[PDB]
Design a protein around this ligand. Structure first.
Ligand SMILES: Nc1ncnc2c1ncn2[C@@H]1O[C@H](COP(=O)(O)OP(=O)(O)O)[C@@H](O)[C@H]1O
Ligand SMILES: Nc1ncnc2c1ncn2[C@@H]1O[C@H](COP(=O)(O)OP(=O)(O)O)[C@@H](O)[C@H]1O
Ligand SMILES: [Mg+2]
Length: 313
């Protein structure tokens, strides 16, 4: 499958955070090989250096605008009929929401503005594009309509998916996404939030349809399941299973050949058609640069490495 992995280190919160007991070193992108590497070391044992390689590594100097310079090329492929998935993964506090939802800057608002710029540019070629979206969340494996039964309906014919009784909204201009985001708006830290965009183009005779799924995943922090109870226990179990399944599915899709467990989780089942075929997927792993989070950071980088496809690994 067409999969890529980016890592992003957010700036440290000053005076409140520090890197006194660990080191995260990011190397310059290697034009010759097409990948970027980094090394993580814990002060308790500096002899053990954990190295990782990804398609791109954004450091603390990389702003949301800098990040989209890479992401724009991916999301525009939806105008050609490609389905696109972008997953922001990382512990709570690592920067997933800032990356995906920062006002005007986030991958979501940026994606919408970029698509409309392209839509206007494609009119000269006789293309007429219509845009509609949905904004849902999956919590404890249940779908919730943030723009408000919800059953997943896979159309094996057109290889598309819809969800019953979920509000869908037209987007006639990039400025309208404001109403959507405003409507939709801790809990979100324990759920997967999914912004779905459908691009329907007609050239009065070519036709094209592509879907973008921009996901802000539930926090990946490791919670000792043996130490939680009640609602916390149930959510931990569901987040663990869901994230584990996602990793397994993406890893399998990146292999040269298999029984991909799409049905093992609500998120992967919902997105199966946007994860298969010639669909393009980008895993965005957010990490903190600080020492207090080094263990979770290593966990996140290990997840990122697992989802790296055999294009790189
Ligand atoms: N790239 C960034 N640049 C500046 N601040 C950031 C960046 N990423 C995260 N932050 C800040 O770090 C904190 C973590 O934010 P958030 O995105 O909500 O994390 P998460 O969604 O992973 O739990 C916030 O106060 C946010 O404003
Ligand atoms: N799976 C993907 N994830 C993230 N970005 C992608 C993906 N596929 C393509 N892109 C984006 O589109 C650009 C070029 O697309 P592609 O035809 O695959 O050429 P290249 O070989 O340079 O990646 C990339 O530089 C990247 O920014
Ligand atoms: Mg968040």
């Amino acid at each position: 499958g067409n999969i890529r992995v980016y890592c992003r280190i957010r700036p440290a919160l000053k005076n409140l955070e520090n890197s006194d007991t660990s080191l995260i070193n990011v190397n310059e992108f290697d034009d010759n090989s097409g990948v970027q590497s980094m090394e993580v070391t814990k002060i308790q044992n500096t002899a053990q250096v954990h190295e990782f390689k990804f398609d791109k590594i954004f450091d603390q100097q990389d702003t949301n605008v800098d990040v989209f310079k890479e992401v724009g090329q991916l999301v525009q492929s939806s105008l050609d009929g490609y389905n696109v998935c972008i997953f922001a993964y990382g512990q709570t506090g690592s920067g997933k929401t800032f990356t995906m939802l920062n006002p005007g800057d986030g991958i979501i608002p940026s994606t919408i503005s970029h698509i409309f710029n392209w839509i206007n540019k494609l009119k000269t070629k006789g293309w007429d594009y219509k845009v509609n979206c949905e904004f849902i969340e999956i919590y404890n494996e249940n779908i919730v309509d943030l723009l408000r039964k919800h059953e997943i309906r896979h159309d094996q014919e057109t290889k598309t998916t819809t969800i019953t009784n979920v509000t869908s909204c037209k987007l006639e201009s990039e400025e309208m996404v404001e109403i959507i985001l405003k409507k939709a708006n801790e809990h979100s830290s324990a759920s997967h939030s999914i912004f779905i965009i459908h691009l329907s183009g007609s050239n009065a005779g070519a036709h094209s349809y592509g879907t973008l799924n921009l996901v802000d995943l539930a926090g990946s922090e490791r919670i000792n399941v043996s130490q939680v109870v009640g609602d916390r226990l149930r959510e931990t179990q569901n987040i663990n299973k869901s994230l584990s399944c996602l990793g397994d599915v993406i890893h399998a899709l990146g292999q040269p050949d298999r029984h991909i467990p799409f049905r093992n989780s609500k998120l992967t089942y919902l997105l199966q058609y946007s994860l298969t075929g010639d669909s393009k997927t980008l895993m965005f792993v957010n990490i903190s640069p600080s020492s207090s989070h080094i263990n979770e950071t290593l966990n996140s980088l290990r997840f990122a490495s697992k989802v790296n496809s055999t294009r790189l690994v």
